[PDB]
Amino acid sequence: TSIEQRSNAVSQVLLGIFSYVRWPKEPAVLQLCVVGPTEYADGLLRGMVQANGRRVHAERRAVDNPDLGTLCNVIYLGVVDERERQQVFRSLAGHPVLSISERGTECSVGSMFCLNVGGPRITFEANLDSIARSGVRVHPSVLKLARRQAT
């Protein structure tokens, strides 16, 4: 599976996940921030559209932007260090933000979902603590998407 192939797939898995999530004040345009170095975010940085027609606007922002929490609805988190990671999740505390990381190491440190972009399919894990404190509602059937992503 090539990088273009995986990036495209990451896009559709992210749409999949978004469809199980609700924000307390649903915006007309869903804002996505890509934070830190990423390999697979070029597809989602094109912008996306959800099944109901709501647009997902994407852009990159710096790790140390203190207003990440009010600047977006969704965070796609790349490869950052301990300090940077702390920085980011302290910015998000108390705000209704969905967090997904590109690598599956981050479910232990604050990300709600962590992708494993490797093998034949994009799979992901989730973290209940981070989900519970996130300020958004995640429907538990989101794990249907994950389960089906093996085989």
UniProtKB/Swiss-Prot annotation:
Chain segments annotated as coiled-coil in the UniProt record: none
| Residues reported to bind GMP | R22, R137, H139
Recorded superkingdom? Bacteria
PTM note? Cys-33 and Cys-72 form a disulfide bond in the oxidized form but maintain their free form in the non-oxidized YfiR structure. The Cys-145-Cys-152 disulfide bond is well formed in both structures. The Cys145-Cys152 disulfide bond, but not Cys-71-Cys-110, plays an important role in maintaining the correct folding of the protein.
Q: Where in the cell is it found?
A: Periplasm
Impact after mutating R60A: Forms monomers
What keywords are assigned to this protein?
Disulfide bond, Periplasm
Recorded GO CC terms:
periplasmic space
Instruction: Describe activity control.
Output: TpbB/YfiN repression is released through an YfiB-dependent sequestration of YfiR to the outer membrane. Binds vitamin B6 (VB6) or L-Trp at the periphery of the dimer, and both VB6 and L-Trp are able to reduce biofilm formation induced by YfiB L43P mutant. However, VB6 or L-Trp alone may have little effects in interrupting the YfiB-YfiR interaction. GMP enhances the binding affinity between YfiB and YfiR.
Q: Which cysteines are cross-linked by disulfides? A: C33-C72, C107-C114
Knockout mutant characteristics: Deletion of the gene results in the generation of a small colony variant (SCV) morphology in PAO1. Mutant exhibits slow growth, reduced motility, a highly aggregative and wrinkled colony morphology, strong attachment to surfaces and strong, exopolysaccharide-dependent resistance to macrophage phagocytosis. The deletion mutant, although suffering from a tremendous growth disadvantage, shows characteristic persistence behavior under antibiotic selection and during prolonged infection in vivo.
Biological role: Negatively regulates the activity of the diguanylate cyclase TpbB/YfiN, leading to decreased c-di-GMP production. Inhibits TpbB/YfiN allosterically, through a hydrophobic interaction between the C-terminus of YfiR and a conserved region of the periplasmic PAS domain of TpbB/YfiN. Under reducing conditions, may also act as an YfiB-independent sensing device that is able to activate TpbB/YfiN in response to the redox status of the periplasm.
Q: Assembly state and interactors?
A: Homodimer. Interacts with TpbB/YfiN. Interacts with YfiB. The YfiB-YfiR complex is a 2:2 heterotetramer.
User: What protein am I looking at?
Assistant: Negative regulator YfiR
Species of provenance:
Pseudomonas aeruginosa (strain ATCC 15692 / DSM 22644 / CIP 104116 / JCM 14847 / LMG 12228 / 1C / PRS 101 / PAO1)
